[PDB]
């Protein structure tokens, strides 16, 4: 038993990073638009590709389309990949995230990558990043935490923009507080620091953004992450 | 100047309090089984946490009112001279609740007593909750499904759970819980040097490795713990001066 053990990150490929980016929603859902989310998407694409990920973005997919895309990524072989990343930028509530037209239970999506159903990721880090809450010239929109911040299974790391009792913030131009600080830390420390230690820096960056001095006073934001990783996780430059 | 290696300040006069609520049996109308082995867990934890400098207080089988009084009492004393605060629940639990002897208590009311407003002297200091709780039902191994929602609790809170949803918690009637045993072994070896979440990760690995493939009904009941961090800095328990 070795206390310093790291996930093996010397495969041919870093692996895939999926980004599901949702700005608009089916009219009859009566959900507000997530303005600024495209800046989050681009920020994340830049940062994750620089860490060696093959990034695939999908904008405003309907539930059927989103399920098809995610099912196929889950069934292609990851044997020659280090890990897998998935990002959801949408409205969400409880155990659900919204596609364009309907809610989907998060666990049905994460479940596609558990060992029984994805042998080639067994023992490999599976990282889900979730920027989702329920929505009611750069302005700051502010919404209450709504998505249950739960873990997902062995070797899953679930990263949430905001925890219960706190508020998520999104600027119409620069994007989400959480994504901005995440990408800033990825950019500086992504390629050297242990990933949970980096996420801890993100907690600090977000928690210290001040909410004193509209009706947004006191709506503090604190993210969280739920880890079932069993080893240290680094993204040293590949070669 | 943002410092990527920043640590929580751990050079206060005292390490702080570690509360342990240990529950072995229950009000009969609850129909909750005994939790044989829990006393092994309690004593294992007491030794390991005191060795890290904690002032350990154990309470056995408190009723809900007593437990609420005891925890409110700890939350209203000054922690100005403490590095941090630790609270352990060894009981049955379900969803957002943990059982006292006679009734359920919402976890959020227990953790909420130590958040900013209500505990100013713990502001910006690590608050660590460790929860060994699920719903039941010679050293036999007893197994129960994960039942307690594995949620975080607030800024500078670190919530540690014996088991995640879909997995199973195991308790040996003599040696105590798989999770507590492994947690304690890692505290003994690494508590004094390793960053705390780094240590919890080692615990995830140990528990996951415990083989589930003596009772045919228990084959394949894998255990994997988890933790939910809202910490903002690195957390070490180096021996105090």
Q: Residue B185 belongs to what H/E stretch?
A: helix B178-190
* Nearest CB to B232 within list A193, A207, A227: A207
* Nearest CB to B204 within list A194, A220, A229: A229
Q: Report the number of secondary-structure helices (H) and strands (E) in chain B.
A: 5, 11
CA distances from B219 to A212, B63, B112 (A): 55, 35, 39
Q: Do A224 and B229 touch (CB under 8 A)?
A: yes
Does domain B1-241 fall under CATH 2.40.170.20? My reply is no
Tokens 């969280």 found at: A224
Task: Report chain A residues whose CB lies below 8 A from the CB of B2.
Answer: 201, 205
Task: Report chain A residues whose CB lies below 8 A from the CB of B234.
Answer: 197, 200
Q: How was this structure determined?
A: X-ray
A1-239 fold: Rossmann fold (3.40.50)
- Identify the DSSP state of A56: E
Domain ranges of chain A: 1-239
Q: Do A227 and B230 touch (CB under 8 A)?
A: no
Task: Report chain A residues whose CB lies below 8 A from the CB of B150.
Answer: 150-151, 226
Query: Any chain A CB within 8 A of the CB of B165?
Result: yes
Q: Do B164 and A149 touch (CB under 8 A)?
A: no
With 0-12 / 13-18 / 19 or more C-beta atoms within 10 angstroms meaning exposed / middle / buried, residue B132 is buried
Neighbours of B11 (CB within 10 A): 8
Q: Report the candidate in A141, A94, A99, A126 with the shortest Cα–Cα distance to residue A230.
A: A126
With 0-12 / 13-18 / 19 or more C-beta atoms within 10 angstroms meaning exposed / middle / buried, residue A193 is buried
Closest chain A residue to the Cα of B207, Cα to Cα: A230
Measure the CA–CA gap between A80 and A95, rounded to whole angstroms: 32
Q: Report the candidate in A128, A17, A82, A121 with the shortest Cα–Cα distance to residue A236.
A: A82
DSSP bridge pairs for B57: B19
DSSP bridge pairs for B89: B21, B131
């Amino acid at each position: 038993f070795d206390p310093a053990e790291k996930y093996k990150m010397d495969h041919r490929r870093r692996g895939i990073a999926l980004i599901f980016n949702h700005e608009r929603f089916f009219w009859h859902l009566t959900l507000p638009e997530r303005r600024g989310t495209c800046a989050d998407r681009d920020n994340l694409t830049r940062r994750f590709s620089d860490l060696g990920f093959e990034v695939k973005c999908f904008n405003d997919l309907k539930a059927e389309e989103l399920l098809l895309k995610i099912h196929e990524v889950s069934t292609v072989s990851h044997a020659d990949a280090d890990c897998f990343v998935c990002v959801f930028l949408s409205h969400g509530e409880g155990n659900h995230i919204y596609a364009y037209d309907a809610k989907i239970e998060i666990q049905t999506l994460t479940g596609l990558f558990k060992g029984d159903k994805c042998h080639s990721l067994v023992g490999k880090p599976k990282i889900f990043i979730i920027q989702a809450c329920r929505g009611n010239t750069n302005i700051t929109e502010v919404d209450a935490a709504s998505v249950y911040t739960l873990p997902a299974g062995a070797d899953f790391l679930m990263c949430y923009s905001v925890a219960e009792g706190y508020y998520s913030h999104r600027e119409t131009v620069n994007g989400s507080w959480y994504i901005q600080d995440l990408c800033e830390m990825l950019g500086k420390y992504g390629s050297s620091l242990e990933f949970t230690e980096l996420l801890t820096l993100v907690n600090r960056k977000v928690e210290q953004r001040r909410v004193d001095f509209p009706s947004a006073i006191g709506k503090k934001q604190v993210p969280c992450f739920a880890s079932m990783l069993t080893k240290k996780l680094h993204f040293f430059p590949k070669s």
